[PDB]
Design a protein around this ligand. Structure first.
Ligand SMILES: CS(=O)(=O)c1ccc(Oc2cc(F)cc(C#N)c2)c2c1[C@H](O)C(F)(F)C2
Lengths: 290, 250
C-alpha cells in the first residue's frame, strides 16, 4: 500500500499527462524516470506543438550500448509505437537485425551520422493501428551527431511512399520508374521543361548514362542501400541536361513489390530538381552534342 | 519470476546512481520525487533539433511571404542575425531561381520542399523545409541543413563523357573529343599499347590498370599522359556500364 502511493506520486510527477501517468506499471515508472534524468543530463552538456507538428520525423537519443533514453512525443504519428512504450528499451529490439551491425557502428566513436535503418511500425497507411506482432518494417533516414559515456542524437524521417502521398508536390519535382537494372521504364512529363528530355528518349536507358561521372560512385551506394532496405534518399547529384550543362537533383526511391507475385517489380523514384541548368556552355556528354 | 525483481532492483540502483543528493526503496522513490521536483523543456527541444538535424524554425505569412517569426537558431544554421531575417520576406532569403517553386508552396495541410537559402556573415546552402499551414495565413516550417581530367568510354574507346578540364589539359573543347576514339588521339607507336590496356581493363573487370601514351594536343604536340582506368559494372546485372579513366598530364 505505502509504495503504491509513492509510485502513483512519481508517475504523476513524471512529465506526463495525469491520464497516461496513472496507467503505468512500476517497471515503466522506473524506465521513464531514469530516461528523463539521463536525458536532462545530456541536455546540460548540449546547452513546442509547433516544432513537433512542423517536423516530418521524430527526434531520438540513444546511448552507445543502444538504450533509447529519449524519443520525441510525435513518434507515434509515424511508427505507431509510443514514447511511453519504447523509452528505456534497446534500439536493437525494434530494428531489423540485418541493420543492427550498421546501427552499432553508428552509435560508436567525426561526429556526424547519416544512415538508413528499418524500424518496427504499427500504424497503418491511412489512420489505423495494428498490434506488435503484426508489425511492418519502415525505413528511416537518420541524421544527427554522436556526442559525449556516449550518445547518438538523431532525427529520423520516414520516406513517404510514392503511392501514398499525404504531401503535395510542386512543379520542380517529377516521377520516374526503373527496372532493377536502373533502366528507365517510365518517366514523368515535366522532365522536359525542367531538363529538356522527352520521356521516350530516356526509356531503356540506364540512369548511369546521365550521372555526372563525379557522382556515379555515390549513386551506386545509394542504390545498394535502396536494395538492402527497400527505400533510400540519394545525396544530391547532378543530371546531365539535354543541351549541355546539368541540374542538381535529389531523389528518394522505393522498390515496389508485386503484391500477388511477391517479387519486386521496379523502383519508384521521386525526383527533386534543386536548380536551373548550370554550365550549359559546357558539353559533358555525347547526348549534349547532337 | 526471479529476474523480475532483479531488474526492478537494477532500475533502483540506476536511479540512486543518477540522483546526486541520493538508502531504501521508499526513500529513493521519494528523493527522486524531490530531485525532479527541483527541475521535455520547451526552448530545449529547439536545441535538440539544432544538434540533431541542424534545423531552425520560422513562420512566414502565406499571403505575402512576410517573416512573422524566425527562431534565433537561424544564426548557427545560416550565419544570419535574427534581425536580418525577422520582419523580412522569405523570397528575400532564397535563391532567385527558387522564387517560383516558393510561390507554389505558399498558395491557399502539410508542406515539404527544398531550396537554396542565403547565409553570409553571395553564397547559398541547400535547405530542407517541412511544416504546415496554420491560420492567423501563415506557414510553420523547419529548415535543416544536409593536373588531369576524367573520362568515360564505351568498351571500344569512344569518348562518351569528358569534364571541361580537358580544355586545360589537352587544348580541345569537350565536343572535339566526344564521339571519337581515344586511340585516334594516340600516337601510332603507342596505339597497340593503348588497346592492350583496353582489352585488359575489360578482362581484368573491376580493377584499375594504368597505361602511358602520347596524346596529340589541339596544337599537335605529343603529350605524355598517364591514364589509370577501370571498368565500371552494373550493381544488379554486372553488365559493363562503361570504362572510367583519369587522364593525367604527365
Ligand atoms: C532510389 S535512388 O538511388 O535515389 C535513384 C535515383 C535516380 C535513378 O535514376 C534516375 C532518375 C531521374 F529522374 C534522373 C537521373 C539522372 N541522371 C537518374 C535511379 C535510382 C535507383 O537506383 C534506380 F535504380 F531506380 C534508378
Amino acid at each position: 500500500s505505502k509504495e503504491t502511493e509513492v509510485f502513483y506520486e512519481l508517475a504523476h510527477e513524471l512529465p506526463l499527462p495525469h491520464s497516461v501517468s496513472s496507467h503505468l506499471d512500476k517497471a515503466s515508472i522506473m524506465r521513464l524516470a531514469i530516461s528523463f534524468l539521463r536525458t536532462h543530463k545530456l541536455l546540460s552538456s548540449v546547452c513546442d506543438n509547433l516544432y513537433l507538428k512542423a517536423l516530418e520525423g521524430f527526434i531520438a537519443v540513444v546511448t552507445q550500448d543502444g538504450d533509447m533514453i529519449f524519443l520525441s512525443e510525435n513518434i507515434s504519428k509515424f511508427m505507431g509505437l509510443t514514447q511511453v512504450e519504447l523509452t528505456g528499451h534497446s534500439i536493437f529490439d525494434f530494428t531489423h537485425p540485418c541493420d543492427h551491425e550498421e546501427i552499432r557502428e553508428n552509435l560508436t566513436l567525426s561526429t556526424e551520422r547519416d544512415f538508413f535503418m528499418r524500424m518496427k511500425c504499427t500504424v497503418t497507411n491511412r489512420g489505423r493501428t495494428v498490434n506488435l506482432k503484426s508489425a511492418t518494417w519502415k525505413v528511416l533516414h537518420c541524421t544527427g551527431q554522436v556526442r559525449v559515456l556516449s550518445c547518438l542524437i538523431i532525427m529520423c524521417e520516414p520516406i513517404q511512399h510514392p503511392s501514398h502521398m499525404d504531401i503535395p508536390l510542386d512543379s520542380k519535382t517529377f516521377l520516374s520508374r526503373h527496372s532493377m537494372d536502373m533502366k528507365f521504364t517510365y518517366c514523368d512529363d515535366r522532365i522536359l521543361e525542367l531538363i529538356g528530355y522527352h520521356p521516350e528518349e530516356l526509356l531503356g536507358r540506364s540512369a548511369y548514362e546521365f550521372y555526372h561521372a563525379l557522382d556515379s560512385e555515390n549513386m551506386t551506394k545509394s542504390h545498394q542501400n535502396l536494395c538492402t532496405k527497400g527505400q533510400v534518399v540519394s545525396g544530391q547529384y547532378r543530371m546531365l541536361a539535354k543541351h549541355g550543362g546539368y541540374v542538381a537533383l535529389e531523389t528518394q526511391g522505393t522498390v515496389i513489390y508485386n503484391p500477388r507475385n511477391l517479387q519486386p517489380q521496379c523502383i519508384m523514384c521521386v525526383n527533386y530538381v534543386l536548380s536551373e541548368i548550370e554550365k550549359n556552355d559546357v558539353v559533358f556528354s555525347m547526348d549534349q552534342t547532337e | 519470476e526471479r529476474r523480475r525483481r532483479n531488474k526492478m532492483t537494477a532500475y533502483i540502483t540506476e536511479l540512486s546512481d543518477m540522483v546526486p543528493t541520493c538508502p531504501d526503496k521508499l526513500t529513493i522513490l521519494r528523493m527522486a520525487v524531490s530531485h525532479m521536483k527541483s527541475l521535455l523543456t520547451d526552448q530545449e527541444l529547439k536545441h535538440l533539433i539544432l544538434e540533431a538535424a541542424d534545423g531552425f524554425l520560422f513562420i512566414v505569412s502565406c499571403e505575402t511571404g512576410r517573416v512573422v517569426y524566425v527562431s534565433d537558431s537561424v544564426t548557427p544554421v545560416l550565419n544570419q542575425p535574427q534581425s536580418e531575417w525577422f520582419g523580412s520576406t522569405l523570397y528575400d532569403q532564397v535563391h532567385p531561381d527558387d522564387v517560383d517553386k516558393l510561390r507554389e508552396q505558399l498558395s491557399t495541410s502539410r508542406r515539404s520542399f527544398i531550396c537554396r537559402m542565403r547565409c553570409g556573415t553571395p553564397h547559398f546552402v541547400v535547405v530542407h523545409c517541412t511544416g504546415y499551414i496554420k491560420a492567423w495565413f501563415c506557414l510553420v516550417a523547419i529548415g535543416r541543413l544536409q593536373t588531369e581530367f576524367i573520362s568515360r568510354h564505351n568498351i571500344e574507346g569512344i569518348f562518351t563523357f569528358v569534364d571541361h578540364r580537358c580544355v586545360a589539359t589537352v587544348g580541345y573543347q569537350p565536343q572535339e573529343l566526344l564521339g571519337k576514339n581515344i586511340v585516334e588521339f594516340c600516337h601510332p607507336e603507342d596505339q597497340q599499347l593503348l588497346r592492350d590496356s583496353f582489352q585488359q581493363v575489360v578482362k581484368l573487370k573491376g580493377q584499375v590498370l594504368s597505361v602511358m601514351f602520347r596524346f596529340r594536343s589541339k596544337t599537335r604536340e605529343w603529350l605524355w599522359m598517364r591514364t589509370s582506368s577501370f571498368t565500371f559494372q552494373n550493381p544488379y546485372s554486372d553488365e559493363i556500364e562503361y570504362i572510367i579513366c583519369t587522364n593525367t598530364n604527365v
